[PDB]
Amino acid sequence: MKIKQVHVRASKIKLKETFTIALGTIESADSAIVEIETEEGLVGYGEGGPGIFITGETLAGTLETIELFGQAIIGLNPFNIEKIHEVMDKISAFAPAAKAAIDIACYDLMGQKAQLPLYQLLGGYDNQVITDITLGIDEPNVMAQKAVEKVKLGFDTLKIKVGTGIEADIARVKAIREAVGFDIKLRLDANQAWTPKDAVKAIQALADYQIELVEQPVKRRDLEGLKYVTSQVNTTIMADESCFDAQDALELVKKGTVDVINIKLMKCGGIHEALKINQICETAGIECMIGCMAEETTIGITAAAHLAAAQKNITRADLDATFGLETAPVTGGVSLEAKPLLELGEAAGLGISH
Amino acid sequence: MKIKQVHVRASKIKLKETFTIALGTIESADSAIVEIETEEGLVGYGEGGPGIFITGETLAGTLETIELFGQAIIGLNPFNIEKIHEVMDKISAFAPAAKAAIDIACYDLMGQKAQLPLYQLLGGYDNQVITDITLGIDEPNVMAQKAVEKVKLGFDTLKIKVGTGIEADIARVKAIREAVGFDIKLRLDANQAWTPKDAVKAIQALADYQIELVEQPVKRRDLEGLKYVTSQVNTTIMADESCFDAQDALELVKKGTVDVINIKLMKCGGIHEALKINQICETAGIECMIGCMAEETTIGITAAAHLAAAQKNITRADLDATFGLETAPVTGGVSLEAKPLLELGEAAGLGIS
Ligand SMILES: NC(=[NH2+])NCCC[C@H](N)C(=O)N[C@@H](Cc1ccc(O)cc1)C(=O)O
Ligand SMILES: NC(=[NH2+])NCCC[C@H](N)C(=O)N[C@@H](Cc1ccc(O)cc1)C(=O)O
Ligand SMILES: [Mg+2]
Ligand SMILES: [Mg+2]
Description:
The structure is a homodimer.
Chain A: E1 3-21, E2 24-38, E3 43-48, H1 59-72, H2 81-91, H3 96-114, E4 128-130, E5 133-135, H4 140-153, E6 157-161, H5 166-180, E7 185-189, H6 196-205, E8 213-215, H7 223-230, E9 236-239, H8 246-255, E10 260-263, H9 265-268, H10 271-283, E11 287-290, H11 298-310, E12 314-317, E13 331-332, E14 341-343, E15 352-353
Parallel strand pairs in A: 5-6, 6-7, 7-8, 8-9, 9-10, 10-11, 11-12
Antiparallel strand pairs in A: 1-2, 2-3, 4-14, 13-15
Helix pairs in contact in A: 1-3, 2-3, 4-5, 5-6, 6-7, 8-10
The structure holds a molecule of 2 linked components (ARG-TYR) (2 copies) and magnesium ion (MG) (2 copies).
PDB class: isomerase
Keywords: Enolase superfamily, dipeptide L-Arg-L-Tyr, isomerase
Assembly: dimeric
């Protein structure tokens, strides 16, 4: 198998609602979609979802970088994922969105060539995954109200954003908890909004509210502070923005900074790197959750789902990007229907087309 | 795809010459060969080559463990390597040769089902690997003579076994270098024979002999002593017995114990675990060398070679076990011919039988 050409396009999908977190707001899912054509005719799909306030990556920069990658890998075999990453890494010192777009299309091609759904090439642990659904920052009563709706859809786990103030945030969670029950799992995400000591105070305050875990409570670069929190509360602390790639993961398990690590293909540059992170974490006894950017769609979510279902240590999933899309940019893959169960079929690769 | 049956049998193959290392001698390559058959008819080949003075595993124990593993994975998909290792790990707390045997057969099946050479499923970086050849412990003049012989076979890298005493060990290396010149790369392996200070002393004494690297100079459990050697000499230090699995590797990287790590499928329980070790090392800027047990045959060596060719970070290889074998247990795969280049064909999976 040999890459004949790489085509990249912009993709802009209107979001059903404006999503808000501690870092900013978004109202449209704008990403870069890649199609890698082989000499034999097979075409793999990939996506790069840039999050300016998460990674600093932009759609313009991502499109440019992908174009450089595409010309550099013509003639290579999609199965030589080792060299493909070598090539991209030599070209750019940092561009996980661009690299993920190329990486994902390559794994899609691998599945299609082997004639196997992707999850079978990535571990084969399972052929489906259960995802939570996130609730963007809003008024305590507003969020609590939306919870009942999602639960009604079948969701047993809700991801709750907070970060305006320990005061209002605590009010947020409480409102939601005593609103949907106690059989519903509740994970919180403060997107670096709290200081070390305020984080501890805020977390402990929800002791009787039964919180599954708290995601990135402090600034991504404040590793001593993040470890402070983790070591001050019994509640499970998860690192997100503090962990982009495998080298970050190694540093975290090294220092014993957190309990769980959130993996995003758009932060690490694709499945090849995500596998490394998960392997490092599993070896250290740290479970992983697979997440997503608000700007990615069907292709990125589908890729992440195959990986999550395939790897045992990826024990949690936050793949709800497609639930907010007004329309699907492609055919097949994870549907836009807001449901917790993402079942991967037997279609080869990502099972995506059109 | 589903596993229908698991067959396992004993293979006892004489070595053409007794192989001596610091830990003892080996006279026969006795391994367990497994054949995993799927309901559709595809059959995967695997092997468990236990090295008693390395892991403590025996052929009898490896056979009993494989049998336990075999009857527990009936009906599972070979592609579900994640669950297959979970099942084996729950059954046994320690049996890397047995686990490798099942693991390798599964990857062979994956390759066959996908209709792809195994190296394509494991990274696809290359389709061949260049191996060194090891010289067993002997008198300086003899080892030197044997060195010239191997170089004549085209080998550009020789792995020198040492460990009977810094006095002799230093004499062995000096003699070898004098015989083959500085064009040949020489890596040493002490198999835990030296104290940390004798190690530094021996290494410093060979500074002018252009030593590529020194493998496991001190006892396996003496990590502080191993790091001591590593931080006392400019020569590259490699861990072998100090690193069995991914957890060991993570510990070595955390402590900055060594510069390179030796991966053996028979130490870590198969390709699945070997990949973890290499990824951990790569992430930490530690290169890896793929090695082998004397007891392995074409099956084990072929699997190791596919993995080494596939992964960029596995930059060195010591896959010379088939060179000492009187016979080959299966057709295909790496041949018995003593040659540095191991070219993997385009046959699906291992390309065996
Ligand atoms: N329906 C809906 N609004 N889904 C958004 C999914 C976002 C995802 N669960 C998430 O929280 N991702 C990041 C935060 C984030 C927000 C916005 C953008 O553009 C990028 C990332 C996280 O987990 O922190
Ligand atoms: N002549 C011969 N049969 N050589 C086999 C060399 C195997 C390999 N290169 C090696 O050295 N492996 C171990 C040492 C070892 C010796 C004997 C047994 O049974 C198992 C392992 C090492 O690298 O230390
Ligand atoms: Mg987060
Ligand atoms: Mg060794």
